[PDB]
Design a binder for this molecule. Structure first.
Ligand SMILES: CCCCCCCCCCCCCCCCCC(=O)OC[C@H](COP(=O)([O-])OCC(O)COP(=O)([O-])OC[C@@H](COC(=O)CCCCCCCCCCCCCCCCC)OC(=O)CCCCCCCCCCCCCCCCC)OC(=O)CCCCCCCCCCCCCCCCC
Ligand SMILES: CCCCCCCCCCCCCCCCCC(=O)OC[C@H](COP(=O)([O-])OCC(O)COP(=O)([O-])OC[C@@H](COC(=O)CCCCCCCCCCCCCCCCC)OC(=O)CCCCCCCCCCCCCCCCC)OC(=O)CCCCCCCCCCCCCCCCC
Ligand SMILES: CCCCCCCCCCCCCCCCCC(=O)OC[C@H](COP(=O)([O-])OCC(O)COP(=O)([O-])OC[C@@H](COC(=O)CCCCCCCCCCCCCCCCC)OC(=O)CCCCCCCCCCCCCCCCC)OC(=O)CCCCCCCCCCCCCCCCC
Ligand code: HEA
Ligand code: HEA
Ligand SMILES: CCCCCCCC/C=C/CCCCCCCC(=O)OC[C@H](COP(=O)(O)OCCN)OC(=O)CCCCCCC/C=C/CCCCCCCC
Ligand SMILES: CCCCCCCC/C=C\CCCCCCCC(=O)OC[C@H](COP(=O)(O)OCCN)OC(=O)CCCCCCC/C=C/CCCCCCCC
Ligand SMILES: CCCCCCCC/C=C\CCCCCCCC(=O)OC[C@H](COP(=O)(O)OCCN)OC(=O)CCCCCCC/C=C/CCCCCCCC
Ligand SMILES: CCCCCCCC/C=C\CCCCCCCC(=O)O[C@H](COC(=O)CCCCCCC/C=C/CCCCCCCC)COP(=O)(O)OCCN
Ligand SMILES: [O-][O-]
Ligand SMILES: [Cu+2]
Ligand SMILES: [K+]
Ligand SMILES: [Zn+2]
Lengths: 65, 196, 107, 180, 459, 186, 226
């Protein structure tokens, strides 16, 4: 059939449902979260803070904020 | 000369009409070959024995007719009539009269070209030759030009490289004077800190 | 190394004094993204795509012969985008030699 | 000139985002009921039944195409007989304006030219030779310095003092000979 | 269907799609590093959570090599065009091709799941024992991923080697690059599997290979015996792509085709016997060091021939053709970038120079110029060349001079300072550093944040 | 390279020749299905690979690299004291391995080390002969070279007698300076 | 051809169990209406009936003899079609090497469809250039842009069908006088008598003509257990 000639015919003929693209981008977004979420979780687990304040592990001036 | 001499397909004969090599599990029947040689006569002996094809004599007039209409075929037909045709003789006859198929270019439809276009064939060939002539000459011209230009990069690289040679040259001179003359070099100066 | 086809002097002699190299344009034309019609369904858009293939185009010379789209590699010979089944008939790589046999000729 | 204005009419701006109305207004997920379109959805995409649930490669809707005589329909060429010869007229693709849109006029001229090839075999062979051995000479120039510096590292020296260093997680331990 | 498809061209797309998805996690991990290295003192990682940083660098290295670049260059483009470059219709082993991509995905899911569930610790992408064998279960999970990835790599290598049987045309330079890469995998992978099993034995079976009286340096030999062929397995497919792009986009026959083919073959032979330049600082014998140093320099000879052959492909091309296409720019950029990376490789091949530059950011910059710029740009260039054949759209990358210029400027900002930092000196795999290295680290960090912003412009 | 199959190809006798290559080239080939086609494909490969001038350069390189590779492997087994293949010495404690110790000193003094060590002064600027003297005698006493290493060492003069500061930076002069202060013995 | 596998047992002969049971209609079916199995047995029954009648062979012309055995007399049209079929089959797994193509003698590129991918490698020796691939479509005389070699596409097409061995036979072979079942019976009695069956195809064929299971031993021959 003519519809079956091209692989991924709907996408190549520009008729595909946009949800397919959204899932691909969402999948990539979820992959990225695997680096950020465990960072926050691990920081809180060992320190009790999600993120440090810059240079908070060093001596700071009295007025430092 | 293939498969160690074992043919892929060959005929086997059995003396008992109701014999089945898959159903029966008896141990007395001896299978025969296509020529009828019993299996317990080894091939190195049976292949030496001369086997010839015997057709019923009623076929002789027909075999005679084939030889006369095609004289090149007569010697093989005579062997068959006289019972002197072996399998090899039959094979020689078979392949001797096999001919290849013929393709006729005059029967091929041609792509459409007008009469005026057909008269310009020499011109287009003439243009093609000049393109090749121009192509071949330009290759020599370009090869000389660009490979020569590469020398500029070599000279440019040598000059810029020589700048760092001079810097290194001056650096070694400076280092030789550090321990001898430089006031930056100090002795009896650093004292141990001690454990905190 | 390859340096073009060899040419003999006699092959360069023209049959007329006004012959000059033909000025035929080998720019296939102006193109862009293939623009489909909203009315065409999936099947008819496939036909539209198959009719926009640059590798099916050629330039017709003055003698009726055509110089086609050509590429160094066969990657440019399949329909764009590549279909599921590309080379149904095996592409033929034509070699040339000087050998000949009598059966091909007739006197 | 502006070539976009030539085919502006063909390009009518769209109404819905991504080309579909909300599924409530029109259910594009259902298979089309139009005769001859049972393999397509309403929006024109192939239906899951045709491609997945009842795919022919899995044994559904078995229908051998080849006929008894081992033949399949083949469309013949456009044949013409003229000047005592049977000719075939090739199919020319439609104008690129129809498929792409721009009007095929004022095309820049690009002449026929044969392949750009490097000539002068004798000169070219020397260049290839240099490409190989100029890097080789550089390598040879480095080799001798490399041997010398390696030998300097492993030279046997008349040391008079030993310091033992042990690496531990995560600190360094030093052992030295105490003077008598 | 979507998962059951055996079409090689579809599977090639899946390899490219999966590499991009995994690329995001790799980019995230890379972004975490440069943010932390912006200045001395903790910025986004607690001092009490330094273990996480070690995991970030370990995964960044592993994911980018085995899950991103290798599938992209050895699985994605080859599965799409290799059967087309050959006159054959489809890949020889269709079912094996399907399982290979599925295997890659499952191993990725195992790795990322281990981040979420296991305690986060790191030992580097090289997994040197004894540190690797005294760690927690996350190290066990990472080993399973590598072994599983090894299965996909070897079966894919078997698939490409079978093309020699069925190829109905000429073996083009690109086909040679894939074939020789397959040969390297076949000879190097089994050695890797053997040593990885020994790591598991110590971790999980109470083996004592990596305790006193057992030479830990034994691991380094077997690992790097696969390690260096791996870097050559990554780059060789990139060389094949560059050869096609330069010839096609310039309408020039590839010059010295046989010299190119022999150069690829020579590199593989040399690349299999020079692994110990990764082990200069361990204290090898004098004669051993001289041998590896001498043979390592020889690898430049065949690699140099390819560079020059590429240059003459671009020289003399017609001026009328537009030269601003992204694929052409990337191909040309590769020559400029690769030379930088290779030259720095020759500098660190001299073992006495390497004594100062081992385990420093000079080595980081060395392999980033080759991989993060060169290999990525080659993969980008190949995908761009095949845009019409592949048929993807909804991006502005084909003619985008801003993207090429900004990418080139900013990636150079990231990694040029790292050469300078190497002499300063800053060790690798380090979170904190002395205050006097901040300026150069700050400049590279500004480069990293800038590059990520540029990627958003393609859409 | 002939272009007609009628003209034979010259072949020598031995294990790597045209005849030897023809016999084995088509063993695994599905394309060489008849004499005419087989010869055409054979000559096509021979013309493309063996008549390519630049290809011979790579043949030289593989030979050199393999020759070095085999020699270094063989040398380690034959001469390296630390490499054991026989088991007599491994069945004894370290102090009793007299036969193995015989390899130590000769393996410590290869010819090339003696030749190239004196050229350390092409790299070190101050006290290039700091380690030349060793009274123990396991190695020869080193004497600094009189010329720079050939090649890329344009930074230093061609011969060290052209350098006005070379003698002042020698270990002997520095030892004189520091001894005069009582700073150190060396 | 080299790319074909081993000959099967069927490539030599078919089992008698494949003989159509309605022999009377089989011998009356026109050739264009006979399937592969029906055509095989029509030729074997009719061919062996004439060959097993020695007394009539010498008086039978080659045209009649060829017709009885089902062999097609060769003519320029049929020879042309068959020749191009074999060339197409050979090129499936063989190299494509031949003389340089010119306008007078274009390179012939057989194809079933309207298009086939071809590569030009130029002439011999120095004239050989890098492969230049192009799509050879019907109805155009293609000219290589580098060496000026001329290519042309030849289509194996005929009346909505592509050339095949069976198609050639049907188009050109003409059915002769209808086969007479009396000849089958006459030859059957010649070689099959008193439990000796030296003409077994005729023995089965005659049994089917008489119905099925009429001749001695045929009921036992047709009874099977599975
Ligand atoms: C490196 C980056 C930069 C790169 C730059 C360079 C790039 C150069 C270009 C490269 C191009 C390469 C070649 C491309 C070829 C494309 C071919 C193609 O399109 O094929 C057609 C193919 C399919 O089209 P089709 O043929 O129409 O398919 C029809 C379907 O088969 C059938 O239709 P259907 O509707 O029936 O579909 C079924 C559908 C059914 O759909 C639905 O039912 C959808 C329902 C809606 C769901 C939406 C998601 C909801 C999420 C909720 C999250 C909540 C979070 C709450 C948080 C709370 C916190 C407090 O789905 C399913 O049933 C299964 C879905 C499974 C997959 C999706 C998984 C998502 C992630 C899951 C994560 C799970 C995490 C768990 C972790 C737990 C750990 C313990 O297209 C796609 O799949 C989309 C591809 C899109 C990209 C195309 C290329 C464009 C160019 C590149 C753009 C840039 C991309 C950058 C990367 C992404 C960044 C983020
Ligand atoms: C002696 C003892 C005996 C004991 C007996 C005990 C027996 C025990 C049994 C054990 C075995 C159980 C399993 C049996 C499997 C059977 C297979 C079979 O025959 O299937 C036929 C069956 C045919 O289906 P059907 O019934 O005809 O209906 C199919 C549909 O009608 C339409 O057909 P379709 O095929 O087109 O539809 C399928 C597809 C259609 O939907 C789509 O494709 C959606 C459109 C695409 C959107 C873009 C996706 C992204 C781009 C991916 C590019 C690379 C793709 C590579 C190829 C696909 C790989 C899956 O949707 C899906 O199935 C999901 C697709 C998922 C794609 C994943 C791509 C990468 C995701 C990256 C995630 C990043 C975030 C990280 C965090 C999360 C990590 C998990 O196969 C399928 O189609 C379904 C397969 C479902 C099973 C998949 C299992 C996956 C497991 C993964 C590991 C999870 C472990 C860790 C969990 C962690 C969670 C966080
Ligand atoms: C004292 C001891 C003395 C011992 C004496 C021992 C004597 C032994 C005699 C051996 C004679 C061999 C005869 C057969 C020749 C080859 C013919 C052939 O293959 O027919 C095609 C045949 C297909 O038949 P076809 O239809 O005729 O093919 C048409 C073409 O495809 C269509 O292509 P085309 O027409 O366009 O082009 C034709 C040709 C185009 O190619 C050629 O003509 C290549 C010609 C040169 C080949 C090399 C010859 C040796 C050169 C001297 C080396 C000396 C080193 C000395 C070191 C000493 C150190 C101490 O194509 C091929 O050859 C395709 C196959 C190439 C496979 C290459 C695999 C990688 C190996 C490395 C490459 C060679 C580098 C040599 C050194 C380079 C630096 C100087 O191929 C196959 O059947 C494919 C099977 C694939 C199996 C793969 C899996 C095997 C297991 C792998 C294990 C790991 C291997 C590790 C390798 C490491 C490499 C670095
Ligand atoms: C694709 C990836 C890739 C590629 C191609 C290379 C190629 C090379 N690499 Fe690299 N390398 C890595 C990836 C790569 N490397 C990685 C990832 C590491 C670190 C691993 C880790 O520790 O985690 C590493 C580490 C590494 C080290 C240090 C190992 C250590 O101690 O930690 C060295 C040392 O010599 C080295 C050398 C080389 C050389 C000599 C080449 C050669 O192939 C380069 C040759 C190219 C040229 C020289 C330029 C082109 C030629 C010319 C312009 C003309 C000729 C030039 C001369 C004669 C100088 N590499
Ligand atoms: C392919 C491999 C790869 C790639 C792309 C990168 C990319 C980058 N890497 Fe690197 N890196 C490694 C492999 C890679 N890296 C390895 C192996 C190590 C050693 C690990 C160890 O220490 O053990 C390392 C180490 C490493 C360190 C040292 C960690 C430490 O020692 O503390 C740092 C620090 O900044 C760093 C930074 C970066 C940055 C900023 C980028 C990038 O941001 C540069 C610019 C790139 C982009 C902006 C993204 C472009 C898009 C893609 C790359 C995906 C494209 C996908 C397709 C085309 C399908 N990397
Ligand atoms: C305290 C200070 C906090 C400051 C926070 C500042 C945040 C700054 C963020 C800057 C980065 C922004 C990134 C934007 C990414 C855009 C991605 C994108 O375009 O996706 C495209 C993609 C595909 O779309 P099209 O290609 O158009 O498809 C149609 C057919 N072509 O779109 C989608 O898939 C849409 C959905 C994608 C997921 C986006 C949302 C993900 C979830 C985010 C959660 C954020 C939580 C924040 C909590 C904060 C609490 C304080
Ligand atoms: C301590 C454990 C260490 C890890 C152990 C992992 C398992 C062992 C290594 C992987 C096993 C598989 C190796 C590859 C086998 C050969 C593949 C190949 O090319 O064969 C082709 C041929 C199929 O060809 P088609 O695609 O059908 O072609 C059709 C057209 N003619 O392959 C097969 O038949 C393969 C059949 C089995 C599947 C093998 C591939 C998938 C991977 C299997 C992994 C098994 C894991 C077992 C782990 C156990 C650990 C104790
Ligand atoms: C690995 C250990 C395996 C033990 C096997 C025992 C069976 C022995 C027979 C088979 C193995 C071959 C070795 C036989 C050796 C016989 C003579 C002997 O005993 O030699 C011992 C001697 C050293 O022993 P020691 O005296 O203790 O050490 C002194 C200081 N190094 O051993 C050797 O030198 C020989 C060992 C190596 C033999 C193999 C060849 C070496 C060169 C390999 C080159 C590889 C590169 C490629 C070559 C290409 C060639 C075409
Ligand atoms: C039926 C088929 C059988 C095939 C079997 C194949 C076996 C080999 C497979 C590959 C593994 C090689 C063995 C591993 C060798 C490691 C040696 C090593 O690490 O030793 C170095 C020293 O080694 C060297 O000097 C380096 C030599 C390089 C050895 C390379 C061998 C393998 C090469 C394979 C390359 C691919 C094949 C090429 C074939 C020919 C190409 C033309 C360590 O030295 P030190 O730590 O200082 O200790 C010295 C004394 N204390
Ligand atoms: O590894 O270079
Ligand atoms: Cu390396
Ligand atoms: K920090
Ligand atoms: Zn040509």
């Amino acid at each position: 059939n003519l519809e079956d000639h091209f692989d991924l015919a709907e996408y190549m003929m520009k008729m595909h449902n946009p949800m397919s693209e959204y899932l691909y981008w969402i999948a990539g977004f979820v992959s990225g979260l695997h680096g950020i979420l465990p960072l926050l979780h691990s920081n809180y687990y060992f320190s009790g803070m999600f993120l440090p304040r810059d240079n908070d592990n060093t001596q700071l001036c009295d007025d430092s904020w | 000369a293939y498969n160690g001499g074992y043919p892929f397909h060959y005929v086997v004969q059995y003396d008992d009409p109701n014999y089945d090599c898959e159903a029966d599990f008896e141990f007395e029947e001896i299978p025969r070959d296509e020529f009828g040689v019993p299996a317990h006569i080894p091939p190195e002996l049976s292949t030496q024995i001369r086997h010839t094809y015997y057709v019923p004599p009623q076929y002789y007039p027909f075999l005679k007719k084939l030889g006369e209409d095609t004289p090149e075929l007569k010697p093989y037909t005579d062997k068959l009539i006289m019972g002197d045709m072996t399998y090899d003789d039959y094979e020689e006859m078979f392949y001797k009269f096999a001919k290849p198929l013929k393709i006729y270019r005059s029967r091929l439809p041609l792509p459409y070209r007008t009469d005026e276009e057909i008269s310009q064939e020499k011109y287009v060939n003439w243009c093609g030759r000049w393109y090749s002539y121009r192509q071949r000459l330009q290759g020599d011209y370009y090869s000389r030009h660009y490979f020569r230009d590469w020398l500029i990069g070599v000279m440019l690289g040598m000059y810029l490289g020589n700048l760092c040679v001079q810097q290194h040259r001056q650096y070694r001179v400076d280092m030789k004077l550090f321990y001898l003359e430089a006031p930056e070099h100090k002795i009896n100066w650093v004292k141990p800190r001690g454990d905190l | 190394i390859y340096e073009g086809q060899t040419v003999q002097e006699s092959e360069l002699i023209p049959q007329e004094d006004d012959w000059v190299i033909e000025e035929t344009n080998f720019c296939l034309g102006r193109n862009c993204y293939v623009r489909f019609r909203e009315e065409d369904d999936l099947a008819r858009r496939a036909l539209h795509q198959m009719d926009s293939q640059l590798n099916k185009m050629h330039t017709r010379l003055r003698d009726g012969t055509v110089i086609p789209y050509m590429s160094f590699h066969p990657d440019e010979m399949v329909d764009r985008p590549a279909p599921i089944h590309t080379f149904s008939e095996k592409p033929l790589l034509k070699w040339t030699w000087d050998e000949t046999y009598e059966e091909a000729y007739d006197d | 000139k502006s070539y976009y204005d030539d085919f502006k009419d063909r390009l009518k701006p769209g109404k819905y985002t991504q080309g579909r109305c909300p599924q409530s207004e029109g259910d594009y997920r259902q298979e089309s009921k139009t005769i001859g379109r049972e393999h397509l959805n309403d929006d024109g995409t192939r239906s899951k039944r045709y491609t997945v649930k009842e795919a022919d490669a899995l044994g559904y809707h078995y229908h051998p195409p080849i006929d008894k005589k081992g033949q399949v329909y083949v469309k013949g060429p456009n044949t013409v007989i003229e000047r005592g010869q049977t000719w075939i007229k090739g199919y020319e693709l439609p104008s690129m304006e129809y498929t792409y849109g721009p009007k095929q006029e004022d095309i820049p001229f690009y002449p026929r030219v044969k392949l750009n090839v490097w000539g002068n075999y004798n000169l070219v062979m020397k260049v290839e030779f240099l490409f190989f051995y100029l890097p080789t000479i550089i390598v040879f120039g480095i080799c001798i310095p490399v041997y010398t510096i390696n030998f300097a590292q492993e030279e046997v020296i008349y040391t008079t003092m030993t310091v033992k260093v042990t690496g531990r997680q995560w600190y360094w331990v030093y052992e030295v000979e105490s003077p008598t | 269907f979507y998962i059951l498809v055996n079409n090689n061209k579809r599977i090639g797309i899946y390899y490219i799609k999966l590499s991009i998805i995994i690329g995001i996690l790799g980019i995230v991990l890379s972004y975490i590093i440069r943010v932390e290295l912006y200045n001395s003192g903790n910025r986004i990682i607690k001092y009490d959570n330094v273990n996480y940083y070690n995991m970030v660098i370990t995964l960044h290295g592993l994911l980018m090599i085995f899950y991103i670049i290798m599938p992209g260059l050895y699985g994605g483009i080859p599965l799409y065009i290799l059967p087309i470059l050959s006159v054959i219709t489809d890949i020889v082993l269709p079912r094996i091709n399907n399982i290979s991509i599925i295997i890659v995905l499952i191993s990725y899911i195992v790795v990322i799941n281990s981040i979420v569930i296991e305690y986060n610790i790191g030992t580097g992408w090289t997994l040197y024992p004894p540190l690797s064998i005294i760690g927690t279960v996350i190290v066990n999970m990472i080993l399973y991923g590598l072994i599983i990835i090894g299965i996909s790599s070897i079966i894919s290598a078997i698939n490409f080697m079978n093309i020699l049987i069925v190829i109905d045309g000429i073996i083009y330079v690109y086909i040679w690059s894939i074939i020789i890469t397959s040969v390297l995998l076949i000879i190097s992978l089994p050695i890797l599997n053997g040593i990885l099993l020994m790591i598991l034995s110590d971790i999980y079976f109470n083996s004592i290979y990596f305790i006193l009286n057992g030479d830990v340096v034994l691991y380094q030999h077997l690992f790097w015996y696969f390690g260096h062929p791996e870097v050559y397995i990554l780059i060789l497919p990139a060389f094949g792509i560059i050869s096609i792009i330069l010839s096609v986009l310039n309408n020039k026959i590839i010059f010295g085709m046989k010299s190119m083919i022999l150069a690829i073959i020579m590199i593989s032979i040399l690349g299999s016997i020079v692994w110990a330049h990764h082990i200069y600082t361990v204290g090898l014998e004098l004669d051993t060091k001289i041998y590896f140093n001498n043979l390592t320099l020889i690898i430049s000879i065949p690699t140099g021939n390819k560079i020059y052959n590429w240059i003459i492909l671009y020289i003399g091309s017609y001026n009328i053709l537009y030269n601003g296409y992204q694929s052409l720019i990337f191909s040309i950029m590769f020559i400029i970038i690769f030379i930088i990376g290779g030259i720095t490789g020759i500098i660190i091949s001299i073992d006495i120079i390497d004594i100062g530059l081992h385990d420093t950011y000079y080595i980081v910059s060395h392999f980033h110029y080759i991989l993060s710029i060169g290999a990525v740009i080659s993969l980008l260039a190949g995908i761009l060349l095949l845009k019409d054949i592949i048929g993807y759209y909804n991006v502005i990358i084909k003619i985008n001079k801003y993207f090429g210029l900004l990418l080139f400027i900013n990636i150079n900002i990231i990694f040029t300072p790292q050469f300078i930092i190497g002499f300063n000196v800053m060790p690798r795999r380090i979170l904190e550093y002395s205050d006097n290295i901040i300026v150069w680290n700050l400049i590279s960090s500004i480069g990293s944040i800038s590059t990520i912003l540029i990627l958003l412009s393609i859409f | 390279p002939p272009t007609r199959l009628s003209t034979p190809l010259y072949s020598e006798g031995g294990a790597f020749t045209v005849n030897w290559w023809r016999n084995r080239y088509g063993l695994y080939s599905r394309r060489q299905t008849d004499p005419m086609l087989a010869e055409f494909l054979f000559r096509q490969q021979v013309k493309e690979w063996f008549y390519d001038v630049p290809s011979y350069n790579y043949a030289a390189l593989v030979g050199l690299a393999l020759g070095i590779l085999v020699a270094v492997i063989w040398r380690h087994f034959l001469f390296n004291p630390d490499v054991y293949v026989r088991r007599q010495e491994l069945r004894k404690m370290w102090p009793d391995r007299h036969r193995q110790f015989a390899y130590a000193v000769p393996y410590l003094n290869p010819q090339l080390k003696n030749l190239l060590l004196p050229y350390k002064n092409s790299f070190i600027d101050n006290e290039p002969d700091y380690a030349d003297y060793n009274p123990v005698g396991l190695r020869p006493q080193r004497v600094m070279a009189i010329r720079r290493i050939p090649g890329f060492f344009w930074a230093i003069p061609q011969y060290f007698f052209e350098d006005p500061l070379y003698t002042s930076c020698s270990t002997k002069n520095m030892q004189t300076i520091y001894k005069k202060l009582g700073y150190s013995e060396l | 051809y080299r790319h074909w596998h081993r000959m099967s047992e069927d490539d030599w002969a078919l089992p008698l169990d494949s003989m159509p049971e309605d022999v009377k209609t089989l011998m009356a079916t026109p050739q264009t209406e006979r399937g592969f199995v029906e055509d095989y047995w029509y030729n074997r029954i009719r061919g062996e009936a004439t060959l097993l009648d020695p007394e009539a062979l010498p008086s039978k012309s080659y045209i009649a003899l060829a017709r009885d055995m089902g062999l097609q007399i060769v003519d320029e049209p049929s020879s042309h079609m068959m020749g191009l079929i074999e060339l197409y089959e050979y090129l499936r797994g063989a190299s494509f090497v031949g003389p340089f193509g010119t306008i007078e003698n274009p390179v012939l590129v057989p194809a079933v469809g309207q298009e086939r991918v071809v590569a030009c490698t130029g002439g011999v020796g120095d004239e050989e250039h890098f492969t230049l691939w192009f799509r050879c479509r019907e109805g155009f005389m293609y000219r290589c842009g580098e060496c000026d070699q001329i290519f042309m596409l030849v289509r194996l097409y005929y009346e909505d069908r592509y050339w095949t061995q069976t198609l050639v036979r049907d188009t050109f072979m003409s059915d002769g006088d209808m086969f007479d079942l009396k000849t089958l019976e006459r030859v059957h009695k010649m070689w099959n008598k008193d439990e000796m069956v030296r003409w077994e195809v005729g023995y089965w064929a005659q049994d089917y003509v008489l119905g099925k299971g009429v001749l001695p031993g045929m009921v036992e021959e047709h009874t099977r257990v599975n």
